[PDB]
Amino acid sequence: GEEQMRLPSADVYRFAEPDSEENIIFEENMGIPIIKAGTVIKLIERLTYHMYADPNFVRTFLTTYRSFCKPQELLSLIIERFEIPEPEPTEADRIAIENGDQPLSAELKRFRKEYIQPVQLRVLNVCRHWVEHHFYDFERDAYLLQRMEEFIGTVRGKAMKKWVESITKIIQRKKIARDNTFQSSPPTVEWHISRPGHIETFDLLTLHPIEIARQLTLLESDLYRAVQPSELVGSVWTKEDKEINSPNLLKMIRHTTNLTLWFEKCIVETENLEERVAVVSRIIEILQVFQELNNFNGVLEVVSAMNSSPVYRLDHTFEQIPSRQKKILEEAHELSEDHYKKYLAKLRSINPPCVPFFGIYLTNILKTEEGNPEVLKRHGKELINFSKRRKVAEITGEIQQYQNQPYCLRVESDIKRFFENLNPMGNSMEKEFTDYLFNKSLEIEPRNPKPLPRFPKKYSYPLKSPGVRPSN
């Protein structure tokens, strides 16, 4: 048909083959059709489609493409997409040109206006969205940026002039931003036994429990806000190149592991029962202040520490914990029950700012990654399951909706550093350290037939807590 005769030949262009059941699949369209699956070539073709813009697809593709296409390959494919061959002149125009006259070129002008110009401006739109929202690809690969700048810098056109200026404007802004707010007054920085500057005395019981929760919420808010959606796609934080692909997410996971294991270590290394009860009671108060601040990440870090194998079994310790703190800690656990039903209800019904629980997102993304195939098979051909990537992108979109919520709390550089540099494991591996904590639990509180021995005190300061009510 004349429609495919107008589009370029396959031997001069790869992005003009007609759609079929063996190269592209769509979802139930009840409007722009939603792409379920397709070859990389049909994904690139639709990413820069001549008939219409598709901001939703551009956003999803640029967040998830690294799971099926390398950044160097994506740039090559969009540049190949941009270089559209022009058709030959008609017979009458060939005679007109050979006679020294100007051709009519009716179909060539139509093809340029209705196909070459829209596809080229759509490739430029991908380049703009790429540098605006995923500039880290260019920071991790300076050669990729050199190729991008050479490409946009050699583009020649009247409508493409403004596009090339907007892309350049963004690249330079990002480059400078690499190097170089409070609506209300923040509260007074709380102190308990440790004095400001006496970093040598900073510890779980010497610092004020309000200030521990405040600084940890500030630290976790910054860690939460730095994670980009692509660090979570394709489960790249669990693969070989995880350090370069997921640096902000791995930092968040290592903080959560260090804080949780540090709380466990504080409890089980406090061998005197009366003192351990004080330690557990102080961590419950830290959780109470995390609840006040809507830091569900920290609340669930305390729930993980108390539910751990070494701590949960400490029946003699929790026996002396006041009934009200027992109830708070039990209700906090219930946040996780029934696939985090109460947690999700609390997150939606809360007023900002908040530090959501990050573990649930990682769990749900791993469920989506493992429970959906990388490709779909149609007529013996393999198509990239794009709906799989879209579903992971929707979960990361839920993460992004809470990343613009700064807290009105004053940073205390020394307390911040104390929590950034927590190393409970030391030179031990996680399995070695958790076995140590469990054997330590059995030492301080042996199994029921064996009795409870008495251990000496290790703290030369008052164990009484100053509480969770602030000083204003």
Ligand SMILES: CC(C)c1noc2ncc(C(=O)N[C@H](C)c3cccc(S(N)(=O)=O)c3)cc12
């Ligand atoms: C996963 C574990 C194995 C588990 N299995 O069934 C449960 N039912 C409830 C609770 C519970 O409430 N967890 C909180 C954080 C908690 C921890 C330690 C002491 C206390 S408490 N109430 O003694 O202060 C509370 C935990 C579990």
